Amino acid sequence: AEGMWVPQQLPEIAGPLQKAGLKLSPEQLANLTGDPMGAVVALGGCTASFVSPQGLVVTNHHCAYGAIQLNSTAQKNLIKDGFNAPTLKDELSAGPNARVFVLDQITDVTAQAKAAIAGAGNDPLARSRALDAFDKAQVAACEADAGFRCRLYSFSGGNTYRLFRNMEIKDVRLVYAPPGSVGKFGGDVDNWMWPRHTGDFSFYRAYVGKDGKPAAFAADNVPYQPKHFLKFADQPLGADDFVMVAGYPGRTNRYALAGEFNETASFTYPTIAKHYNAVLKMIADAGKADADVKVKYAATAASMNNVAKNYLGQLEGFKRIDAAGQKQAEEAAVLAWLKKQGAAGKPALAAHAQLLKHLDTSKSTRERDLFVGQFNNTSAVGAAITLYRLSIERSKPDAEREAGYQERDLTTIEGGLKQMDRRYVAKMDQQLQTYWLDQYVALPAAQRDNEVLNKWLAGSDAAAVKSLVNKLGGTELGSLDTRLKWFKADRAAFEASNDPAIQYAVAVMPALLKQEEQKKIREGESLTARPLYLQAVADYKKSQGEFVYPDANLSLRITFGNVMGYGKDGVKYTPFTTLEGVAAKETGEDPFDSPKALLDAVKAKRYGGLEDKRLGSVPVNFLSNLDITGGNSGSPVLDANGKLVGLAFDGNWESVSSNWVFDPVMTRMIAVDSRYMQWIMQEVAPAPQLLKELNLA
Template sequence: MKKLLLFVVSVIMLVPASVKADEGMWFLMFIERLNHRDMQKMGLQLTAEEIYSINNHSLKDAIVQFNGGCTAEMISKDGLVLTNHHCGYDAIAELSSAEKNILKDGFWSKNRSEELKPSSLYVRFFVRMDDVTKRILAVVNPSMSELEREKAINQETAKIEKENNEGGKYTVSVRPFFQGNEYYYFVYQDYTDVRLTGTPPESLGKFGGDTDNWEWPRHTADFSLFRVYADANGNPAEYSKDNVPLQPKHHLPVNIGGIQENDFAMILGYPGRTNRWMPAGGIDQNVKFAYPAWVEGSKVTMDALKKHMVQSDAVNLIYASKYAGTANYWKNRQGMIDALSKFGTAKSKAGQEAKFNKWANKKENKAKYGNVVPTINKYYALTNEKSRHDNYLMQLLRSSAYGTVSRGLGRQLEMYAKADATKRAQAAPAILAMAEEMQKEVYLPAEKDMLAAQLNLYAKKAGYNLAPMVEKLAKENNGDFTKYVNDAFESSLFTSIDKIKAFLETPSEAMVTSDPLYVLTNDMLNHYNFRSEELIASQNDFGAAFRLLVEGLRESKIGTIIYPDANSTLRLTYGKVRSLPADKRNDATINNYTTLEGQVKKYKKGDAEFDLPVKVLQMTADKDFGRYADKDGTLHVNFLTDNDITGGNSGSPVLNGKGELIGIAFDGNIEAMAGDVIFDSKLQRTISVDIRYILWVIDNFSGAKHIVDEMTIVK
């Protein structure tokens, strides 16, 4: 998901008149200078001060980063938070059990006392930001190695963060932009007492499943509701029954008037990562080497998990979140391969770099920029095969909970065995709790299947230079790790709480370091992290060259991008409600929204992806939409805008020109899957849940009108 920033006077000179308003992820502090007039022409009715203000409440005070990976928004004066269902998925699954499966059945608290507290969940409020480019760049020089440069920057960063955290009250983060050519610091305040208020049943919240993911038309209620709590003075506090709902500085009014084609649409959120400055060699490497391995490894994990998840609700709850996350990236990476190949993105980037290289080798530029492109290309040539290997190995390490056991529980047990009796007594309860928590989150037959299948794939396909132990075992077992993994799980210390307890009574370092799962995972992790001297040198040269490439593209004006990549900092993107060409799969009059009738047409009784509650079928037949029906008589479910977003924008508010909530973003369309690398103004769309459908699910379908009543509803 995608839209960005720009910086002070020097950057203003770089803004060409041809830049489309719907491309870019912009810093809020520069809206007045760079975007406000353009936004007003498109329909914005707010001042820049009403969007971002340090001294007064503004829109930014209603936008939070949700648990580090999504976005959410405050929608009531009593701390109610709205985000995506898939963003709250971990917490909802954690709070579910086979006996009370709220992930499957949904949940609506009747009052504050019924709200549910997951073990770990936080929201982050953005306080302010500022430019520290001159200060950071003053501590580095061109003669430094990348490691020396990083060390100097880290030291200065620590000073800046300490100066601005007000004795620990705030979290401060200094972040690089334009590949380390500019730096800004961001001040945040975190609240950790966040409780589940409501969630639709999974049949609505995840309707369409993997099949519809990244597709249009969509028909899903991808939302969930939480509440932020604080101490009596409104300050962050650990969970306590004495905490009270947070009174936010600003909450978003909710507009149920509906949307039309070409209506202004603005999104504020925390886009995670884009790579629009990536060189041609990097794009080529991803398409041909890294992403195919990622896709294949993900599919192996999904197949191994699915076999067990369909057999038991309890097992399904254990792995629901992991499966959903794996499936999301599996489809995303395949879509990236297809889109980047179709558009010839690497080729067009290479053409740009050829122009840059010609400019770079002019007499006046050669000393600084002459070797930039050759250095970058040399690095990618060196690492192409390794990138494929590393992605197969990465999927192996990520798949099973035991894939990295030597670095987690294994490291703790090793340290325990080396400690004296006093330190052991202190450490034992935490280690046992860690082991018990791990066992609650695994189902051993599934873990065995995942690990064996991933080892089989890695040994067969990774090429390059396999981890030594894996290579040895592959030869000894004819490439089939099934028996080895089964035997390892049977004898391993890490797969049994009883064995862990016995170890804590009579610890032995050798028992840990000779454990078959410890030895195997330690070997793989060491291999994954190993860097040859040649690679270290090449990475150093590449880091400097990439930074110079970005600097040179901006200086020469050969580069057409004028904003830095997303990096999980708060950004604003603006555009319009905008349809795609007519699609016979969508029953809507204009292909910029979908309807509840369209959702029912996809209904398949008992299907894991397309089942629906009987009540939805009946209410659709009766056209029981209440005040949330559109003027055309239908209930709109999802809609399209041409905003520039990426991962991390999930849950972001979609706002009209008055700053009122009209929906929440949750996805993009597969035709524009290359959007993290290139922005296609013709095809790229943001898919959002219409706020009227959200309120209908809460109010009419679920009978939780009291939750809607605390919102500020406007037409």
């Protein structure tokens, strides 16, 4: 079924859910801290779920990837080898910034947020500051009890605001990863593709202090005891079976204006794909010369591959469905429908006029901003900017500090500085600086008008770039101890440094703060017009019998439908893959280099009691017509009885343009079957202690 339904829309999907084959009362799903919805957790960018009373958490391999990478070295490469913790004390910290978010409460604060905004009258900076102060005050009250972290969400272009309260678990440990040739079988070749044969799962365990409250890693921390956990399905999942997903999809753009879509299609997606593909080649070459570079940059390479291939898919998808035509036609239809209301339609038409005027004056600056932005987000330079910014914010009262730099953010900033140790190699960072400066100096003179960067380059050729990278080469910010000393330092200490990366951050900061202020003014201008125009689009869609649900915004959503394939002329994709398909893709070379134990078990048809007689093999991956996007990876796929039949992990090639224009015919979720997860843990990369804890052995 189309739609990323908020839990508050359960009454509107209760009937469809039952019709599709849900056997739980839709009432049971409305208890968000209950069984089974209370078992679903946010990771921040990924979804997961509790699968044992001792705080065992299951998610995708690609979601645990960052944690696996932090614990990997060139000599002991857990990305390649996998990992298993036979006992609690074998579990590895997933890193200081790893989180498990357990939902505690949702509060609607729409009326209070709208009053905060209205209070600022016609002043857009005051409007931005008023919402910022409201967000901060809601969060501060909601976080007064230790161990909770709150987040304010804006829905439907600012027509609804809800405050979420989570128990914020901060000691997350790696329990189990399959080898990378299972976790990521087919690599970047099969990414965004069906047929799919990827064992995309891994396990964490949540921990808390001995006092029961969230704590950073400590030896005497103990496993979290969740109120609710999911059970692996005992009923074999088949074609046509009801499935549902709860999770945390990040962002969709289905309510974007036509001009927002056209800028993304014509500029953002092709441009990022081009540059990312070039940076990836540079990282791959560096990784061949030094495995330490390969391991340190593996999480960056995986993320950039995934984005660059996604963007290529979206561009092909837009042609497949004529997204530009569809956007143009719907936008024209909304304006005509508003014009038909006369008086009552004028405010939405005015709001549209206002939004339309924001949609440009980027043609001259967008390449500069991309290149300078990327340069500034290289490791040493970005650490310097973050560290200098923090020293500025610390001089203010906490409530006046920039979101991201408040007291509640300090342990996250520090964690970032710590994680950089496992994700930084000076010689690779120098190549990244050189790449992005090269693109900058190639811009026409009118466009290379970053005064500070022009001062530091003193030239616009390869020699000028080499001289600046050579100068920044002298930074001490590669040192974790130096970064942690700068974390505590005052503004004057930064301003006195002869560290070249620090000096660069000090020089660029005034211009960064002004560009940030202009951003907040532009945001404040939209806080009025965006909700009006998006409410009119939603009212129009409702008049056309179209499904009305908010764009994804990182909050909890429910999607549902059934196990089913899809088709193109001459081809029907079947809803399941099987063990034999994994072996048929074997090449003996990454990324089609399955573990020997897998090839041996498939050749022997060692099905481990998990064969689905309807397929004649153990299923591997399955297709369904659910509506998921980035953020949904690791979401539990539940059957009619609320049991875990798999994890969401990807979409097929034709699904990715549904970020902008939903296509029910060719949009499918790709999930890993819970039977494949068990079969891997039985026959290939054994986790006998996990199978015991999951009640599967």
